[PDB]
Amino acid sequence: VNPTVFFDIAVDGEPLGRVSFELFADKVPKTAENFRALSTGEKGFGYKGSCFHRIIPGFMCQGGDFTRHNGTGGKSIYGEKFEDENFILKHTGPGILTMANAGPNTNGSQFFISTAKTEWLDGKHVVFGKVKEGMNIVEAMERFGSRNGKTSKKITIADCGQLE
């Protein structure tokens, strides 16, 4: 019942592999729907062609800024920002999807994929999905990051959509 979405990742335009996510629509339906719709592009905008602008090995991959490509942009399907829906789910380990934000109730389109347990984010960032297939591809992406987050190659979402 929970939706599955996929990202096809490229590295300087060269295919790397696919990552699929389960979105926890049962518990955070508003947050899950935003990511789902941005992945299909069905509202006329979304993640296809956008880059991961910040990757910190041993911490997370960050993406979703499809308007400014650097962490200063993005928007949700509900407007420029929407509310923290709940904090039911926790940052338990690698492979968690969690919203990036700039304070309370400032969710847009940016997100983190964790590559470590990040428990200090509990109750501040809204967890809304997990990596289902392709965690090995997230691990491969992580190798193009650096301590300050700058990527050594351009990591893009070459295609994305819904699998079920």
Numbering used by the authors: 2 to 165
From the paper:
Besides revertants to wild-type CypA (Ser99), our initial screen of ~1000 variants identified a variant (S99T/C115S) with increased activity. There is a weak epistatic relationship for C115S: it decreases activity in the wild-type background and increases activity in the S99T background. Our data show that the S99T/C115S and S99T/C115S/I97V mutations increase kcat/KM relative to S99T by 3-fold and 5-fold, respectively. In an effort to determine whether the observed changes in kcat/KM are due to changes in turnover number or substrate affinity, substrate binding was detected directly by NMR titration experiments. The dissociation constants are only slightly changed relative to the S99T mutant suggesting that the two mutations function by modulating the turnover rate rather than substrate binding. Interestingly, the exchange contribution, Rex, for group-I residues gets bigger with consecutive rescue mutations, indicating that these mutations increase the slow interconversion rate from the major to minor state (i.e., Rex = kmaj→min). Although we hypothesize, based on the NMR data, that the Phe113-in conformation is present at low occupancy in both S99T and S99T/C115S, it is not observable in the crystallography data. The interpretation of increased conformational heterogeneity of Phe113 and Thr99 was additionally confirmed by an alternative ensemble refinement method. The size reduction by the C115S mutation could contribute to the faster transition between the major and minor conformation due to the relief of a clash between the larger sulfur atom and Thr99.
